[PDB]
């Protein structure tokens, strides 16, 4: 999670190398909030990207501005998640429920 | 009177209304065991109407209050006298209990008498509860706890929380 946008959606972005997830909006209700935090206090989010930047325009091809902003933000995050051991493997993994696993019983 | 939950001891006093004949009537105090004070004053007028020429219309409540246990952390032996009713005839008893509070022993008395003689709480008229020493006890069930070196295990521990593991693998162990 990066920041709270204007309309209430969450600007959430895992690294594209690990999660294969771009700078993408996500509603806060359909979100499991894991109590695992990194320090993004010292990153520089671009001000030009906003809710209107992620608004659907009208076949989707990736613009070169999206690619530049993808590596502009990931370059600040990816060194920081490498400071926490086994965090990149945690992000590459997928979340699922197995036998005997109950979300109400476990904490996260 | 419904012996609901644990009982409470209420100290209710009362007197007759002032009359042209009598300036100030005498004051009568009693020990009333009841769940609340509303049923305690009703039970107060029940016994007062038997002993004296008193009714609730001609009388009044001067002070209705609850007295607390003076030593609730001291284990004590209580002697309790009974005036219950049976299906045929009425009988008196003396019963011994071992409890921390006087009201708890009366509560233990009400649940014990209904268990043994099937006597309801409306058929039971409590009269006297008194603290007695351990050396003056009579019933051997109470006197068997008067031991400075009392020692006993828990032989057959009936296991609870039996349904949280409703289906399990290992046979449960009823021994600890």
């Amino acid at each position: 999670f990066l920041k709270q946008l204007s309309s209430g959606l969450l600007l959430v972005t895992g690294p594209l190398s690990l999660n294969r997830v771009p700078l993408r909006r996500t509603h806060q209700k359909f979100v499991i909030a894991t109590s695992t935090k990194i320090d993004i206090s010292g990153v520089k989010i671009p001000k030009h990207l906003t809710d209107a930047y992620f608004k659907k325009k009208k076949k989707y091809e990736i613009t070169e501005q999206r690619k530049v902003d993808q590596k502009a933000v990931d370059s600040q995050i990816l060194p920081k998640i490498k400071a926490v051991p086994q965090l990149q493997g945690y992000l590459r993994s997928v979340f699922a429920l197995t036998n005997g696993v109950y979300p109400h019983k476990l904490v996260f | 009177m419904k012996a609901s939950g644990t009982l409470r001891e209420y100290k209710v006093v009362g007197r007759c209304l002032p009359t042209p004949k009598c300036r100030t009537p005498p004051l009568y105090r009693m020990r009333i065991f009841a769940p609340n004070h509303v049923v305690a004053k009703s039970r107060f007028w029940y016994f007062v109407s038997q002993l004296k020429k008193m009714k609730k219309s001609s009388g009044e409540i001067v002070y209705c209050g609850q007295v607390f246990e003076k030593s609730p952390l001291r284990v004590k032996n209580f002697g309790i006298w009974l005036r219950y009713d049976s299906r045929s005839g009425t009988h008196n008893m003396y019963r011994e209990y071992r409890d921390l509070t006087t009201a708890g022993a009366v509560t233990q008395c009400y649940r014990d008498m209904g268990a043994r003689h099937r006597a309801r709480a409306h058929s039971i008229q409590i009269m006297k509860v008194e603290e007695i020493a351990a050396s003056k006890c009579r019933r051997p069930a109470v006197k068997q706890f008067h031991d400075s070196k009392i020692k006993f295990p828990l032989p057959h521990r009936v296991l609870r929380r039996q349904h949280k593991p409703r289906f399990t693998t290992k046979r449960p162990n009823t021994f600890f």
Partner: protein
């Protein structure tokens, strides 16, 4: 035969109730299914607590059958029950349960990754000894 006995001064573990998970020491026995008990050092005020919600331990500290709360605390500190209880295998597997209970999803992933190679070495170690046994069996 029985090895644990309800008696004056035995340290007990509370099963359920508002004081569940704490230690407590028997002072006196009130009734057949209820006893007067006092956990002066474990935030358990002097009260009556039945045999239903207590698991009795193999710890005995000596004081008279109706000693006040001052002497129970002094006997608790003299015997030093709190340090010895943490060294008991009973409490070591008790405290591991909330460690599993508070285990974070990130902590859940690291346990799963560590469990993989830990079982890999043991299975590889076990594999070396099954084949080593059969040469020794022939």
């Amino acid at each position: 035969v029985f090895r644990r006995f309800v008696e004056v001064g035995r340290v007990a573990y509370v099963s359920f109730g508002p004081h569940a998970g704490k230690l407590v020491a028997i002072v006196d026995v009130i009734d057949q299914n209820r006893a007067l008990v006092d956990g002066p050092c474990t935030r358990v005020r002097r009260q009556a607590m039945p045999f239903k919600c207590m698991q009795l331990t193999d710890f005995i500290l000596k004081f008279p059958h109706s000693a006040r709360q001052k002497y129970v605390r002094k006997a608790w500190e003299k015997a030093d029950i709190n340090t010895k209880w943490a060294a008991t295998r009973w409490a070591k597997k008790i405290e591991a349960r909330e460690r599993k209970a508070k285990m974070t999803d990130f902590d859940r992933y690291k346990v799963m990754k560590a469990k993989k190679m830990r079982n890999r070495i043991i299975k590889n170690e076990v594999k070396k000894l099954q084949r080593a046994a059969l040469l020794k069996a022939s």
